[PDB]
């Protein structure tokens, strides 16, 4: 990440001193000792998952005493939750029911 000197406002570089790593200016004496953990997270875009779960994938989220689906009122349906973008997104819930003479997709 860009961080800039309070004195002259040139761009800082990270270098190493005799006791700590420092943010340092190239044009003035200013240095800033890294005393504690500092971080910067990118969170890039993941792949699409839409065509990855279709067609009898290896899902696993089903559990004992799980709810029945609302149309058929039978537990013959899978349900899962996934991030669609990066993991800062709140996870979305989705479910699909597959029964005899009955095909549907629901949200």
């Amino acid at each position: 990440m860009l961080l800039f000197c309070p004195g002259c406002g040139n761009g800082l570089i990270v270098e190493e001193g005799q006791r700590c790593h420092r943010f340092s200016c190239n044009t003035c004496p200013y240095v800033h000792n890294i005393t504690r953990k500092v971080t910067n997270r990118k969170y890039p875009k993941l792949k699409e998952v839409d065509d990855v779960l279709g067609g009898a994938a290896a899902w696993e989220n089903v559990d004992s005493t799980a709810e029945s689906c609302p149309k058929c009122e039978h537990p013959r349906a899978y349900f899962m939750q996934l991030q669609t973008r990066s993991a800062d997104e709140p996870m979305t819930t989705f479910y699909k029911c597959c029964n005899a003479q009955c095909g549907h997709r629901w949200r």
Binding site: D50, D51, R105, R107
Partner: protein, 50 residues
């Protein structure tokens, strides 16, 4: 052997049929418009929702 304006004039059997087709076809389009902007649209494989 001749062509005239009466050879391309739509008879009453078509003008009723055409009105039904337009209303049915436009209303099916309007529902998918609503399903894109404000709901679920069954996204066909290999293409974006638009």
């Amino acid at each position: 052997f001749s062509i005239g304006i009466g050879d391309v004039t739509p008879g009453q059997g078509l003008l009723k049929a055409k009105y039904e087709l337009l209303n049915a076809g436009y209303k099916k389009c309007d529902e998918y418009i609503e399903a894109l902007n404000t709901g679920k649209l069954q996204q066909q494989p290999g293409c974006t929702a638009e």
